[PDB]
Structure formats: C-alpha cells, structure tokens
Amino acid sequence: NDSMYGFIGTDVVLHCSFANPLPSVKITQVTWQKSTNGSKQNVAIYNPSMGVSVLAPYRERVEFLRPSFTDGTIRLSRLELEDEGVYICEFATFPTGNRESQLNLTVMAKPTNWIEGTQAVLRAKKGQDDKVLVATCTSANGKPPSVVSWETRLKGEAEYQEIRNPNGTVTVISRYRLVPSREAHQQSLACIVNYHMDRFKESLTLNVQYEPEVTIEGFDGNWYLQRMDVKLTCKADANPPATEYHWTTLNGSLPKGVEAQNRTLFFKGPINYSLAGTYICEATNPIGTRSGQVEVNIT
Amino acid sequence: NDSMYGFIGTDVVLHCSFANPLPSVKITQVTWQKSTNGSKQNVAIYNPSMGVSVLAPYRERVEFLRPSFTDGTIRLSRLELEDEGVYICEFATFPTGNRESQLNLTVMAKPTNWIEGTQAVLRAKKGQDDKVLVATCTSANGKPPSVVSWETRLKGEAEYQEIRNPNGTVTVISRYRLVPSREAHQQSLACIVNYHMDRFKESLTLNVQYEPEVTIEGFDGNWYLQRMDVKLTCKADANPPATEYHWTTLNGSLPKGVEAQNRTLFFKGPINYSLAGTYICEATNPIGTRSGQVEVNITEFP
Ligand SMILES: *[C@@H]1O[C@H](CO)[C@@H](O[C@@H]2O[C@H](CO)[C@@H](O)[C@H](O)[C@H]2NC(C)=O)[C@H](O)[C@H]1NC(C)=O
Ligand SMILES: *[C@@H]1O[C@H](CO)[C@@H](O[C@@H]2O[C@H](CO)[C@@H](O)[C@H](O)[C@H]2NC(C)=O)[C@H](O)[C@H]1NC(C)=O
C-alpha cells in the first residue's frame, strides 16, 4: 500500500513502527525481509537482547536509525538495481504474535542520451524515391524507460525501438529517415527525450548535397541606348559549391565584345539595340549541371 | 507444497521443525500464523524464555506437542470448517532472521444422504405424456461435494442441483422424474452417492396404480365334441387388484348352462357344437375398467 522510489546510488529511509505498544506486550525481535515475487529473503534484524544483524547483500548498506521496541526504521544506502522489491518489516512479540508491514521499493536509473548522424553523404537526386537514415537518437539504460521523439520542421519518418536489458533498465533508440532534398539542407533536426519530467534536447544540422539551382541577377528595369559598363552575375545555389560557370546566348553566340570572367558577364561601355537576347549561365558541381536565364531589354 | 486433510471434529498434527540448529544461530521465537489468502492471523507462539501462547481462538484447541527450540509441531483439535487455510510456521532467529514453512489445511465434511419418494400416489394414465417426480436423492452439507447418481432399469430423467452453502459445504440434490406406467410398477430405483471412495446406496420400490389389463387363459388348442368339465380363467393384471369380474359373449347371451363364478367361467361336462363364440371378461378396479377376449373352437379330433 506504500511506495518508495530512489535513484541508483542514493539512500532511502524505510520506515517501520509498532502501532500501540501496551504494557503487557513484549517485542522479541524486529525483522526486515524482502520479497522477490513468491520468495522472502532476510535483510536486517534487530534483537533487543542480541543486537543488530545485517545479511549479505546488505553488508555495509543497512542500519537501524533508532533501534527500539517500537521503531525498526532503517536506511538502505547506495541503492542498486537488485534492491527492487517488496520489503516486509515484522515485529515478533509475546504473547500476541507477529505484526508486519510492507512497502515497495522501486529503483530508478537516469538514462544516457545522445544523437548521431549517418556516415553516409546525404545526396538529393531526381528519381530517388528512397528514404535514407539521417540521424539516430539513443536514450540508453534508463529506468523507467524514457520517451523519445523528434523536434524538426522536416517531414521525415521516425522508427522507434526498445531494448529491455536484463538488469531491468531499457534503452530506447529512434532512427530518423527522409528523402534528401535541397530544402532539407542546413535544416535542424533535434532529438528529444523526456525522462522523469526532464526534457533533454540535442540537435543536428543536416548536410545535404544537391544539383545547382541557377539565377541571374544584375539586371535592371531600364537599360539605355548607350548606357555605360554594365555587368551580369550568375548566383548559383549548390552544395558542394559549383566549380564551373559557362555562358551562352539563346541565339548561340556571345555578341563580341561581351567578356566572360566566370560567373560574371561584363558588357563594356556602349550598349545598343543589338545585345537584345536570352542569356544563360550553365553551372556545374559534383552532383550536377543546370542553367538559368535572362531576357534583356534595351530602349 | 504440503497438504493436510482432516474431517470435521477430528484432530490433525501440523508438523514444523528447524533443520540444522547451529551453535551460531539462536532461535528467538516460534510462531504459527494462519494466512487466509491476503491476511495473517496469529495462532500459537512458543518463546523459549517466556513459554507458550495460544491466541484465541483457539484457546483450548492447539498445543505444541513438544515445545522446543527446534520443534514447533502443534496439534489442532476438534477441527472446524473455519480452520481451512494456509498455515505458516515461522522460526525467528538471530542473527540469520526468519525461517518459515507452509502447509495447507483442508477440512472435510461427510455428507448426509437419503432418498425420498413422492408423497403423491403414482397413477398411470393413457395419454399422459407428462413426466412426474418420483424420488429425490439428497446428499447434504458435504465437503468436498459428493457425486449423486441413480441405479435403476427404469427409464426416467434425472435432474441434478448443487447448492454451495456459505460455510463451504455443498448440498447435491437429484430429482428423478418419469411418466408413470404399468411397467414402472414394483420396479426398484435406488439412489447412489459416492463420497471419499465410499459408495452409499438407498432404494425405493415404485408403486404405480393402473387400469386392468385383461388376459384369458384355460383355453386349449383342442376342445372335443363332448370333452369334460373345462374352465376359462380371467387373470386381470391390475393395481390395486380388481374387485369385480363380469362375463359376456360377443353375441349377447350366455349359453345355458355355462356358470360364472367370478373370474372363472365353468363349462360343465358335455361340450357340443354350440358353445362356439367370443368370450369377454370385464375387470374393474378403482382406476379402471377394461376387457379381454377369446375365440373358442370345438371339433371332433384332438
Ligand atoms: C544494465 O545493463 C546494461 C547492459 O549490459 C548496462 O549497460 C552497459 O554498460 C557498460 C558500461 O557501463 C557497457 O560496457 C555496455 O555496453 C552498456 N550498454 C549495453 C547496451 O550493453 C548497464 O550498465 C546496466 N544499467 C545500469 C547498471 O544502470
Ligand atoms: C452448512 O450450512 C448448512 C445450511 O444451513 C447447515 O446445515 C443445516 O444444519 C442444521 C442443523 O445444524 C439444520 O437444521 C438445517 O436444516 C441443515 N441443512 C440445511 C440445508 O439448511 C450445516 O450445518 C452447515 N455445515 C456446517 C456448519 O458444517
């Protein structure tokens, strides 16, 4: 009817006392036993005439706090998982017989938490429908088991696993999988584990490689007849970054003289009614090759 | 792991002893408790320094046989149903703690058995399809429950009922029903009750009243022209027995001189070619009236 909880390593005080000592009634012995289901083992004994007795596996771990005809309260020190059980405290008395009480000792263990990414190089790819492992969250050897979950704006799938260890602790593992995408890059993925009203949180930032997404800037609403010295710039979003930039027009040739320094496209001084046209930058990176465009107006 | 059985009123010995008394290990106190599946009430205590104590109950019903540091054996006397339960015998010791053993005490009760027939007078009737109670077999307040059955060549139905009393005993009742018939009369129907390998048996003989069933004997394959002094005799099977026997022919009149002394139909001396005919006996009893017949032949050669 009464429960005690304590963490591995800590000390708990197990109370036991005799309700209504009466002059006639003589307490012979006080005995703590522990029940592991169906089975009693002896723990500690206090006998007024004979003293105290602690049994292995309690050798240096139990003492009576105030041994007495009516108080058998003990302290159990340096809790270990093996201490879980039901503790019976029993007063042997004359002439009235035995009188006992019970209490449940539950031993708890705080888990060990961490997150870790794949060794694999996350790589987005057209036609790949395949979900890939990207992070693993572990809450190890906790008791009771912790609860694992994810906090991310990513839209991947999580699988969860519990391993009940023989000692009674439980390791909780979650594997986070997704289909790698441009948008997933540099996104944060946070594993979470609430244990005993603590909330632990540990983050990753995903590194996803992707084919270049090309844009061309430097264009202005108005471009004169004979405006000066105007540039175009090819901003290509890629990971890893793009290593080559090649220019062309929609009509084949780059109108001499429009000079290309890579990923910059300079027009010298005079502009005219020629230089009308689609312009294209072709970016390349380890993943990819792709292009962008500009319609250029001059009046 | 260890079970004791005793009957109500008798005594059992609940053995308890401490295996390996050691100089090291001091027995402080010896205690019997009677666990009632959840609770725990003290029974008797033996303390070497202080003596013996029987809590009450069972003030005059328990004693340690040979109270001792290492023998806690008690006798529980004049057993009662309330004594059922699990008995824990526990040795309190220093420095080694408690040492206990358990045994199950099952208290048994011998049932009371009997049979009793209906007080109604059983009466057969044509067209009555209805099964009627004819005997009740009771095995009362037994524990464990006995097993009731019937031993009869009668063809009736038995219903069985079990009543669990609050004290834990069990009454078994069996009701034996049949449709009363001529054939059921004087048939024996005893009830059987098996308990603790005893076989109890108690019998009834049915008394079924019925309308007469008439037979006519004394007719012989051959009856001469002019054979002597031949009788017809009307045996009427009835219960209670028939009190009246009335004769007639199928053609009305009795050929004089054929004399009727009741339930005998005497033909004096000479027989002839007359005296041919169907003859009928009409029996009557409190239940009934019914008749029988004979077709009578008379010719020359036998
Ligand atoms: C419960 O048992 C587990 C399983 O053995 C213990 O966890 C192991 O601890 C040691 C180091 O402390 C490692 O060598 C193992 O690899 C650990 N983990 C696993 C999954 O095997 C754990 O210590 C026990 N829990 C306690 C004592 O709280
Ligand atoms: C168990 O309960 C029954 C039911 O009352 C007891 O049987 C009765 O005994 C008394 C005499 O002591 C009779 O007058 C009753 O008529 C009995 N039978 C019934 C069916 O009522 C029986 O004694 C109890 N068994 C015990 C105490 O062992």
Swiss-Prot record, chain A:
Domain called Ig-like C2-type: residue spans: 114-203, 212-299
Location in the cell: Cell membrane; Cell junction, Adherens junction; Presynaptic cell membrane
Result of changing P95A: Does not affect interaction with herpes simplex virus 1/HHV-1 and herpes simplex virus 2/HHV-2 glycoprotein D
Family recorded in the similarity comment: Belongs to the nectin family.
Region of interest called Interaction with FGFR, as start-end residue ranges on this chain: 247-264
Bridged cysteine pairs (disulfide): C16-C89, C137-C191, C234-C281
Extracellular side: 1-299
Lineage of the organism: Eukaryota, Metazoa, Chordata, Craniata, Vertebrata
Keyword Repeat: yes
Consequence of substituting T28A: Does not affect interaction with herpes simplex virus 1/HHV-1 and herpes simplex virus 2/HHV-2 glycoprotein D
Impact noted for substituting Q41A: Does not affect interaction with herpes simplex virus 1/HHV-1 and herpes simplex virus 2/HHV-2 glycoprotein D
Organism: Homo sapiens (Human)
Post-translational modification: (Microbial infection) Ubiquitinated by CBL following infection by herpes simplex virus 1/HHV-1 and association with HHV-1 envelope glycoprotein D, leading to its removal from cell surface.
Keyword Protease among record annotations: no
Disease: Ectodermal dysplasia, Margarita Island type: An autosomal recessive form of ectodermal dysplasia, a heterogeneous group of disorders due to abnormal development of two or more ectodermal structures. It is a syndrome characterized by the association of cleft lip/palate, ectodermal dysplasia (sparse short and dry scalp hair, sparse eyebrows and eyelashes), and partial syndactyly of the fingers and/or toes. Two thirds of the patients do not manifest oral cleft but present with abnormal teeth and nails.
Record's protein name: Nectin-1
Effect upon mutating N98A: Does not affect interaction with herpes simplex virus 1/HHV-1 and herpes simplex virus 2/HHV-2 glycoprotein D. Impaired homophilic interaction in cis and cell adhsion activity
Glycosylation site list: N1, N37, N104, N167, N251, N262, N272, N297
Domain Ig-like V-type stretches: 1-106
